[PDB]
Design a protein around this ligand. Structure first.
Ligand SMILES: Nc1cccc(O)c1
Length: 246
């Protein structure tokens, strides 16, 4: 009952109640990624003994992310964004994906939760809850190459999965994650079931900043730079920059 569109829109820097169009969807997606960081720092504290996502009141997540200004993880940020999009009139469908790992394999099949929107006869991928380098504006569900902020994307088909692939400047195509599109479900959120490595990131105007442990990544107009952070003060400055939003 505490979910509130206007409060959410203010939190992400969006004016008014913009119309249910593709241009609005693109703006909402980018603004959300710029304003609401991915952060798994306190994710365990919000988990339910039940292991069923429905036993995590949406108002709890809303209060943490929107009211209090914090970040969250894929089943928090995309769960909230699905609700926002539905209340703004979009036909939103929840989907889950398996994430490409560093070793080239894909992880558990439904680890990463995100959404699709079907609008005006076309389907778009929507994901404001992914820690690593990925798309700041929605992708079309198509193998046709798409270009945004200096990077290229495509959504290919392999062995019954659609695979999101990304290519920054100067590098090869690499998969991001894979999913079965036919399992999309308007009601799919209802069915979801030393400190650990911390993942924190947010979009910028022309790219993304990502901190995985000490591994700091930036992409700016498609040009990537990375650095393993040593100094505690520099590390804290990067954390602050990510969590402050934009
Ligand atoms: N939780 C999560 C979701 C997607 C990718 C990833 O590295 C972690």
């Amino acid at each position: 009952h505490m979910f509130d569109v206007a409060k959410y829109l203010r939190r992400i820097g969006v004016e008014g109640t913009p119309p249910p169009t593709l241009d609005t969807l693109r703006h909402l997606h980018k603004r959300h990624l710029m304003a609401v960081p991915y952060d798994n720092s306190t994710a365990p504290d919000r988990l339910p003994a039940s292991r069923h996502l429905t036993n995590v009141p949406l108002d709890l997540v809303f209060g943490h992310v929107v009211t209090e200004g914090h970040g969250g993880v894929c089943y928090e940020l995309n769960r909230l964004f699905h609700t926002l999009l539905a209340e703004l009139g979009y036909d939103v469908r929840m989907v889950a994906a398996a994430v490409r790992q560093a070793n080239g394999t894909f992880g558990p099949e439904r680890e990463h939760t995100f959404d699709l929107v079907h609008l005006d006869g076309r389907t778009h991928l929507v994901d404001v809850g992914f820690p690593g380098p990925s798309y700041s504006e929605p992708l079309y569900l198509s193998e046709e190459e798409q270009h945004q902020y200096g990077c290229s994307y495509r959504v290919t088909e392999h062995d019954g999965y659609r695979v999101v692939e990304r290519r920054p400047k100067g590098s090869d195509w690499q998969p991001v994650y894979r999913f079965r599109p036919e399992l999309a479900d308007p009601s799919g959120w209802d069915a979801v079931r030393l400190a650990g490595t911390t993942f924190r990131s947010r979009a910028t105007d022309n790219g993304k900043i990502v901190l995985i442990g000490r591994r700091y990544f930036t992409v700016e107009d498609g040009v990537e730079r990375t650095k393993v952070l040593v100094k505690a003060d520099e590390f804290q400055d990067v954390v602050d920059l990510i969590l402050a939003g934009a």
